[PDB]
Amino acid sequence: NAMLYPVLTQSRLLSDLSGVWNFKLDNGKGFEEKWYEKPLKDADTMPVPASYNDLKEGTDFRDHYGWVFYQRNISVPEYVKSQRIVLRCAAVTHYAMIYLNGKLICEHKGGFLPFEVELNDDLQDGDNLLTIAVNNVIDYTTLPVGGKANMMSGMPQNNPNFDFFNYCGITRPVKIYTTPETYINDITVTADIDFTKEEPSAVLNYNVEVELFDEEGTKLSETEGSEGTFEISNVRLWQPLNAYLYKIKVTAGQDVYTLPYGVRSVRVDGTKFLINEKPFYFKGYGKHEDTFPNGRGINLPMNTKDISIMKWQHANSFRTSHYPYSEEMMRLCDEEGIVVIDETTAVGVNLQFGGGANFGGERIGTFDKEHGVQTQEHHKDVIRDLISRDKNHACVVMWSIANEPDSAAEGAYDYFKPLYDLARELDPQKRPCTLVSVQGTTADTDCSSQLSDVICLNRYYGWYFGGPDLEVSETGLRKELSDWGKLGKPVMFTEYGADTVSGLHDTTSVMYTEEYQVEYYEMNNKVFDEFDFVVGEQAWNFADFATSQSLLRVQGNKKGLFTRDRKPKMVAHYFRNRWSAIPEFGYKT
Amino acid sequence: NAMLYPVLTQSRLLSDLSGVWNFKLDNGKGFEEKWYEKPLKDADTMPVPASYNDLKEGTDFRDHYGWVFYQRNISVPEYVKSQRIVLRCAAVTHYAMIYLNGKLICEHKGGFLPFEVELNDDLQDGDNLLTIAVNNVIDYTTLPVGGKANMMSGMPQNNPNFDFFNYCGITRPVKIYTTPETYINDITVTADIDFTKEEPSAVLNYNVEVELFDEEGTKLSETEGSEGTFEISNVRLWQPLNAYLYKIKVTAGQDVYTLPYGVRSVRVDGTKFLINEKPFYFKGYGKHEDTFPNGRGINLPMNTKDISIMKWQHANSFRTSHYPYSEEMMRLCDEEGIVVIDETTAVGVNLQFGGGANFGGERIGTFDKEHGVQTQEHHKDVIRDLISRDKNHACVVMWSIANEPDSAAEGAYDYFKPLYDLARELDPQKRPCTLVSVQGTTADTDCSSQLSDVICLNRYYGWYFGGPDLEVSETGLRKELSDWGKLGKPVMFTEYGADTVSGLHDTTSVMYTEEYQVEYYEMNNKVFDEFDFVVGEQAWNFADFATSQSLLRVQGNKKGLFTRDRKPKMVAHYFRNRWSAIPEFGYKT
Amino acid sequence: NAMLYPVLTQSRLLSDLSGVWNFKLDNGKGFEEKWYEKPLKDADTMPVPASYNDLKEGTDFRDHYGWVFYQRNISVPEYVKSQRIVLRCAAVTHYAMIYLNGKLICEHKGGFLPFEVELNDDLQDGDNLLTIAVNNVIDYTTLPVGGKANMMSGMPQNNPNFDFFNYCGITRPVKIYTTPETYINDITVTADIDFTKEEPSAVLNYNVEVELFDEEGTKLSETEGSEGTFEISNVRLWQPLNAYLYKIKVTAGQDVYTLPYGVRSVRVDGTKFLINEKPFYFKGYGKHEDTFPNGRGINLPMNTKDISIMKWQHANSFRTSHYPYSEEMMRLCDEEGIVVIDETTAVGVNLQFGGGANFGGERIGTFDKEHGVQTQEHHKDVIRDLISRDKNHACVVMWSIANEPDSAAEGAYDYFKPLYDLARELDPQKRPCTLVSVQGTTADTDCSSQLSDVICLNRYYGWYFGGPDLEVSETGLRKELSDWGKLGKPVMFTEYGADTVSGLHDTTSVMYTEEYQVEYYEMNNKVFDEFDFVVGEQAWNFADFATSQSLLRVQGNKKGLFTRDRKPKMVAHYFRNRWSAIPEFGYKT
Numbered sequence A, B, C: 001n002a003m004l005y006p007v008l009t010q011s012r013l014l015s016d017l018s019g020v021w022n023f024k025l026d027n028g029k030g031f032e033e034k035w036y037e038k039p040l041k042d043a044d045t046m047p048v049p050a051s052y053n054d055l056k057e058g059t060d061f062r063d064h065y066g067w068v069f070y071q072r073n074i075s076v077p078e079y080v081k082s083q084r085i086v087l088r089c090a091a092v093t094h095y096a097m098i099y100l101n102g103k104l105i106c107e108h109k110g111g112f113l114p115f116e117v118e119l120n121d122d123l124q125d126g127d128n129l130l131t132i133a134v135n136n137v138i139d140y141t142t143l144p145v146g147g148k149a150n151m152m153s154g155m156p157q158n159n160p161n162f163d164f165f166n167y168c169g170i171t172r173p174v175k176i177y178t179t180p181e182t183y184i185n186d187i188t189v190t191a192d193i194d195f196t197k198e199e200p201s202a203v204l205n206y207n208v209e210v211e212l213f214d215e216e217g218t219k220l221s222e223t224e225g226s227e228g229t230f231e232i233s234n235v236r237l238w239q240p241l242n243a244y245l246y247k248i249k250v251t252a253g254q255d256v257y258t259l260p261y262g263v264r265s266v267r268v269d270g271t272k273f274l275i276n277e278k279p280f281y282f283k284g285y286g287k288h289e290d291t292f293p294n295g296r297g298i299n300l301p302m303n304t305k306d307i308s309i310m311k312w313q314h315a316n317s318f319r320t321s322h323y324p325y326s327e328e329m330m331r332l333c334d335e336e337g338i339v340v341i342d343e344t345t346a347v348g349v350n351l352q353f354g355g356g357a358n359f360g361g362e363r364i365g366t367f368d369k370e371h372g373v374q375t376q377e378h379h380k381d382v383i384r385d386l387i388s389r390d391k392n393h394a395c396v397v398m399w400s401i402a403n404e405p406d407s408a409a410e411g412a413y414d415y416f417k418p419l420y421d422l423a424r425e426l427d428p429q430k431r432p433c434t435l436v437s438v439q440g441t442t443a444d445t446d447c448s449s450q451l452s453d454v455i456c457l458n459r460y461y462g463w464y465f466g467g468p469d470l471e472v473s474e475t476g477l478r479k480e481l482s483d484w485g486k487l488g489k490p491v492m493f494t495e496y497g498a499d500t501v502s503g504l505h506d507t508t509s510v511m512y513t514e515e516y517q518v519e520y521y522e523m524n525n526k527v528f529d530e531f532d533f534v535v536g537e538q539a540w541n542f543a544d545f546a547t548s549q550s551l552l553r554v555q556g557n558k559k560g561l562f563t564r565d566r567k568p569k570m571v572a573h574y575f576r577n578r579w580s581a582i583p584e585f586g587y588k589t
């Protein structure tokens, strides 16, 4: 349930197992032949952490269907056996099956949130054979959802019901860390914060399942007990593009753990998004965890380079489309002060794409209880695990339950209501919750008008709908955006963009050129600025990223402001100039 | 002196400290203000391992001159203090200065080979402040050599006397590992190997400062004592493009260590390069450790992707131009069976570039003992550390003492003779030694004709010399190559190529197009095939890589067969087709 | 009816009116305000010949709907009025309306074949105001056919039912030439040719509505009368990639005209295409008249450069997709010996694209006699004018009645039968006739199985149908191609290809890369080579060309082997290498 980020501490080890491992694609006999008992024969090599799809050559390897087998020896000196020995998989995409010495000792479903297993038993002395089997199959029981054909259909292999590539393998690091036999399992810190003062102060309610410091390291307070409080006069507020992390050192019996924490408040008021009781405006992008050749595999240099590029562009936020990102990127946004919209793996809960699923002649609606999505029981686990992991991040400003689901369809409200409730139940900060809405929903039809504190739109007026007629597409966008203002809620665009192949130009623009992309964003942004209830623009996407092959995809999705190697297209200088004249707070009040 | 690659063992920990650290550029006051004593104020963030140059924005950051300060807290539980606690910096480019709790506890010069320091003392209990200061200054005392102007001169900042970018910072991982208070410090394994038999067998002399296994893990022998021997009948030979690693588990008192070892032989005979007493032919490239945005920082996914690309292209070798590569890439070449020419940091020992260095009107010759290179004392340490690190790699087939030095100049022979001798003294396998020769040397003038077992040429007939006249450049290449045959030694080309901007084409080629690059290699390769003493072609470069800015460099060096993101130019399919019809052994005999 | 190419002769002038003219877009009032009577006010400038769409900036100009007005003064000295003064418009796209001094004196429909008008009357003395009004509207009465929406529909403006841009304006030159009051109006020359001899000879039946020369200019024969004959012993055959043009100087009363003529024979025999009674194999492309910025406007330098590129690539043929090309390019193919498949303007006679045309709920079939295409009466004129213009070209080897019509639909056979009959009636050489068949037709369903001497296919197995699965697409292509062999007729592919953005690469190819395009053609060509009745491959397209904007078109059609500026993609070197090992005659017999 609780996943504290493993760190070197006075009582905890941290043996990163990352490196080149043994690796073999399953041919369909890996389990009956029980490869996880003996070392892998005729093995290949594969570095972890990384998606494996792009790391060898050949369509049979990249488009492989099914299982793969990682393997690696591990050994602990016996003087360490006095402590707990837990193996924490930061992510395994999609389905993991961890064997140790031939014995199955863990299973996990969901390829973007951490999970651990105790190793004290089953850990012989000497060299131990650790095998991790990884499955990539997606279907109606997985998040993200796998369809029965390509998303372009109707216009043995996986068929993503989502517009990105099904990168799989050990996406994030596999580490080993120790704890004493009586350990800290979780920490929770909320902040009630008094703004009546001219010099605002704070009250920090915590709850351990304890010392406070400042940015430098100066000790400022101490308290006993599992539950307690800290009172900070003249407290320093964590703010967008101006972070400040206090340090919280929680000493229990024979175990210490330190957690950075940012002091800030998040509150919706009418048509206004308030961070520290100031009217915020989102500037930024939907991102992907997508680099070359790591695939989805974690890349800490790119994370820092992306964040640099952001501050260069005068952005302040992004959403973790369309899955929870790595812990490291979350802590980084804490240090660098980048506003994050944390989103679940719930993309493709919408059976109107992919041509469609049919039964006895009739088309299957999304939430058909016997032939439709079978994802809600798992959809709930994800909301639980994601909020348990990221509950303490001052950068996490709003939760996103799903990306472009069948929001306006029969069965939709009953599907999302318990998920929205579960989200507000478990988030101790009671943060805003939302859903990122497919094109085609209206204020009346969208079940997000009821459940969500913020309306997040994905609209492509001037690309899919209207292109290349930007004049017509403008009056379309104004007409729908006007009608959204009647909810009295805040509206932001979480996706808008036009595919642009870097290098293509015309003085009289056509689609796919850099000129058109700039004109597209000019037209959209002009209409955004007309409505005081629009509190955010986030372009799609930050950077070109890989997808499944299709007529509609020119070597991936090309809607990025930057190329896959982070080089700027002309639009990136357009946005940099616009976002430079737009503040973080009080844009239009 | 001895650097065994740290691994998880039954007696040794491995706590990788890699992650985001604190980071600050020095402004010139970092040492008088003693930043290494207290946590860094106004700090930035930086991931290790990585070169820092490309990870923030701004020419002042990328072209920074001098020092930077990394910082990070470290903590070990006290039950671990019973063991040795050693901190191993895999590489720090260029000059490292490791402080702990404010106390200077290590220094190192040379930014591409490992170095460690004991942490048992100075390691308080609790949270310890670990600071690493990194200097990037290059001059006549450094390897690589820094000049006084750009290499294009004559046609406060560093000026590389080498054609690549001066990426600096913590290039390779920083880890912590433990050993018992009586530990293994080094292992050495040579192989005398009997080919008179129809089923060749082997004798494995080892020497520890002990059990044998096969590829799977089946135990095959055991022996007592520090020095001993193994006899393997029907031994399996490590071979190019067909690796096989035995496992050697050396158990000493309360400490175990495992080392993979490949059984093969390397011997020069006349005009023939023999691996396992067969006539080898080199196919491949000079490489760089260059990726985006890591800079020189280690990238294990790219290493695997590069090696995949190699086997796709039917290559078999590369040289580590122009510095020793990471341990991980060396072990990978052991697993994947890739022939490596291991090269020192000795590039730029040649003062005829960069316009030149002048004194009282007269130009300074390279090996002027008072105004020239001051590098030999350090040049010797590098040969010592590099051979101590890579002595056991079956993939390391020949050593390269320097890249394009002033090989035919006054003082040259006296400079290189002790280095060549030192190389053969310390390599227990007595492997071939060479020097990669600048253009302009001849068989008579090049001091490598005496010292080297293999003649390695860098020739650009059809680019720098002769372009765009490939007809003229051909008869130039034949005329010089003929004269090299009189030494009766093997000759390979370690560098040849033409800058090619991906995407530029003409049916009637001009320079910088993909057509010209292909025609260039066609002309060169035609002349190579005429001479039975040519035993290898290695193109320059594997991939486009970053350099200092200059009129002659179109956003880096563009001589790669692949782009910086490893996408193939047309020449890469040309070479793949040629190398497919050329075997590894017995090409022409 | 008869259009001899105007040339400088001993009795005929040739005053090319090409240059910058006055030009104005109609706003809807140009005719009621009668702009053709007085010089154009507020005029713009425009060069003729050229398409006007790309020659100014702005989507309103490029996508203009309706009329434009050209204007220019013309003046003839009165001593020339003793002769005929005829104004010959080589092409005006689409609908021309020629005024002189304000009086309407000609009209023409069809924007790709020549038409003339006599100027002896209405030609005052002094400066005469010549106005040409040009209309671009396309609909169900035009060839090419204009639809009611974009071709991507169902997945005030023109909507091409064809995949190229609707370039309009004075496409080809406007010239003035004179004749005496009793003139030559037409010349027709057929060749019966005796191959029983070891040194074949010829008989040249002519017919004027007369002297013979050879390549140099040596006179070889003479004859009187309108109808006559020439007997050439040891005649030199015009051949593919080896042209030879005799010269025919026809002197009548006070008028001389010279016409080049090539002696060759064209005959279908079973599954064999015979030129000079030898078994031919087509190598080449579907082309376009498309360059920058001329649009469709004639470009003689590119024609020569394209033909050079062809001979560089070892091509031998192309088709004039999808309209008759310029006279100059036809005469050039005579000189350079390039085999041409002459095709009419009949593209888009197929109402299954563009989403579709609907009436009372039911969809309109193509050849619905009241709501479908209204093109046959004009379709006949085009066949008449095209064969009258190009009847004498030895390079014109087969006629193409239409490109991808609804060949397998109700009403189709009755639509095409009179067109096919008309084609064989008026071609004195009785040359093969064909139809280029959309994907989806089979040997049974395609009405071209009956009417056509050669089966011409457009198939995209591995792009539109099957991509990116080339394995599956292969067995699809073999299965359909096998079934075509049962007609015992010759089968060639007039179109196959994959969109490829120059510069995109992967070692593991995906769609739109240069690697995929090469693999696509490898798979297709492998299946072509399996069937002795396949007598030709012609790739689509020769070069990237402009189209209307759509999601499916990355700045135009990118299926070219070369870019729009004729620079080669990787596939162009693939084809050059293949076509080099494939002869013109007797490929497989």
Ligand SMILES: O=C(O)[C@H]1O[C@@H](N2CCN(C3=N[C@@H]4CC=CC[C@H]4Oc4ccc(Cl)cc43)CC2)[C@H](O)[C@@H](O)[C@@H]1O
Pocket: A151, A152, A162, A163, A164, A353, A403, A404, A438, A439, A458, A464, A495, A540, A552, A557, A559
């Ligand atoms: O498209 C993009 O760039 C990004 O936009 C968002 N959505 C994508 C799919 N969407 C589609 N909407 C259609 C809308 C209208 C008709 C058919 C539709 O059927 C298709 C068919 C193929 C494809 Cl590819 C997309 C769609 C909705 C928008 C996602 O959040 C991103 O992950 C994605 O990458």
Ligand SMILES: O=C(O)[C@H]1O[C@@H](N2CCN(C3=N[C@@H]4CC=CC[C@H]4Oc4ccc(Cl)cc43)CC2)[C@H](O)[C@@H](O)[C@@H]1O
Pocket: B151, B152, B162, B163, B164, B353, B403, B404, B438, B439, B458, B464, B495, B540, B552, B557, B559
């Ligand atoms: O050049 C390349 O691509 C690769 O080739 C090799 N060498 C580079 C420098 N070399 C030069 N030779 C000159 C040769 C003739 C006249 C002046 C010379 O002065 C200059 C001036 C500027 C530059 Cl940039 C290069 C040189 C020798 C070849 C290196 O091993 C690589 O590291 C390098 O990347």
Ligand SMILES: O=C(O)[C@H]1O[C@@H](N2CCN(C3=N[C@@H]4CC=CC[C@H]4Oc4ccc(Cl)cc43)CC2)[C@H](O)[C@@H](O)[C@@H]1O
Pocket: C151, C152, C162, C163, C164, C353, C403, C404, C438, C439, C458, C464, C495, C540, C552, C557, C559
């Ligand atoms: O496409 C190309 O590159 C070239 O190929 C030929 N034809 C194009 C249109 N064709 C289509 N066939 C579809 C086939 C299957 C389903 C829908 C179809 O609906 C569409 C929709 C949009 C477009 Cl764009 C094309 C088509 C048939 C092939 C033409 O001779 C060329 O002029 C053209 O340029």
Ligand SMILES: [Cl-]
Pocket: A285, A286, A287, A318, A319, A321, A493, A494, A495, A538
């Ligand atoms: Cl977003």
Ligand SMILES: [Cl-]
Pocket: B285, B286, B287, B318, B319, B321, B493, B494, B495, B538
């Ligand atoms: Cl090399």
Ligand SMILES: [Cl-]
Pocket: C285, C286, C287, C318, C319, C321, C493, C494, C495, C538
């Ligand atoms: Cl064609």
Ligand code: NA
Pocket: A496, A497, A498, A499, A517, A539, A540, A541, A558, A559, A560, A561
């Ligand atoms: Na975009």
Ligand code: NA
Pocket: B496, B497, B498, B499, B517, B539, B540, B541, B558, B559, B560, B561
């Ligand atoms: Na090169």
Ligand code: NA
Pocket: C496, C497, C498, C499, C517, C539, C540, C541, C558, C559, C560, C561
């Ligand atoms: Na093509």
